[PDB]
Amino acid sequence: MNIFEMLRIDEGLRLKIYKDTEGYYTIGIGHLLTKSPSLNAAKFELDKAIGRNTNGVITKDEAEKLFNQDVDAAVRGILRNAKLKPVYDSLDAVRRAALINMVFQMGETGVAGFTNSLRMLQQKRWDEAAVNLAKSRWYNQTPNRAKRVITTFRTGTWDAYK
């Protein structure tokens, strides 16, 4: 198990345009297309990302391509963020994946907002962060995904994903 497998599980894999948990146009393994209510704006963005006329359909390879790019952006976002970085550096291999998951899901800015939880993670206070992460809007809005991520941070195992 790893961030790649973890994310595929959490975002799933779709080859045609779909709406995310927020209602936004997405494709593949959670690649956001646009926040516009226009599906043509979505297609437009897609063609320009893929580099061909897709008509809102892509191949598995194309999907895997955006995915790999999206995963790298996430870590890059963590590494460039002064709030995120120090926590990253401190976590283990499994726990880091939980952090990348969160960044993938809500963006660097959304995550750095988790002041109290980030700090507990940093100090290796596993159960305290779990309790904490548990009362956030993220948890009430996407409880299924948050619970698996919370278990990962709490335990440092892939249990929740098995």
Q: Beginning with the edge strand found earlier in the chain, give each strand of the sheet holding 14-19 in spatial order.
A: 14-19, 25-28, 31-34
Q: How many domains does the chain have?
A: 1
Q: Annotated binding residue at 55?
A: no
Cβ–Cβ under 8 Å, residues 27 and 67 = no
Amino acid 94 reads: V
As beta bridge partners, residue 49 has none
Kindly report the CATH number assigned to the domain that includes residue 95: 1.10.530.40
Q: Annotated binding residue at 132?
A: yes
Kindly give, in sequence order, each residue whose CB lies less than 8 Å from that of residue 137, ignoring residues fewer than 6 positions away.
none
Spacing of C-alpha 126 from chain mean position: 20
- The CA distance from 18 to 3, in Å, is 22
Please say whether the dihedral angle defined by the alpha carbons of residues 37, 38, 41 and 42, taken in this order, is positive or negative: positive
Between CA 142 and CA 66, with CA 112 as vertex, the angle to 5 degrees is 65
Residues annotated as part of the active site: 11, 20
Residue 17's CB is within 10 A of a number of other CB atoms, namely 19
**DSSP assigned state of 69:** H
Q: Annotated binding residue at 81?
A: no
Q: Could you tell me the resolution of this structure in angstroms?
A: 1.9
Kindly give, in sequence order, each residue whose CB lies less than 8 Å from that of residue 105, ignoring residues fewer than 6 positions away.
10, 30, 142, 145
Give residue 33's domain range: 1-162
CA nearest 42: which of 64, 107, 28, 67?
A: 28
Kindly give, in sequence order, each residue whose CB lies less than 8 Å from that of residue 71, ignoring residues fewer than 6 positions away.
3, 4, 7, 100, 104
Letter string b/e over residues 88-110, b meaning 16 or more CB atoms within 10 A of that residue's CB: beebeebbbbbbbbbbbbeebee
CA nearest 23: which of 13, 8, 38, 9?
A: 38
- The CA distance from 3 to 86, in Å, is 19
- The CA distance from 78 to 88, in Å, is 7
Tell me the CA distances in angstroms from 47 to 31, 36, 58, 61, one per residue in order: 13, 16, 10, 15
As beta bridge partners, residue 16 has 57
Identify the H or E element spanning 17.
strand 14-19
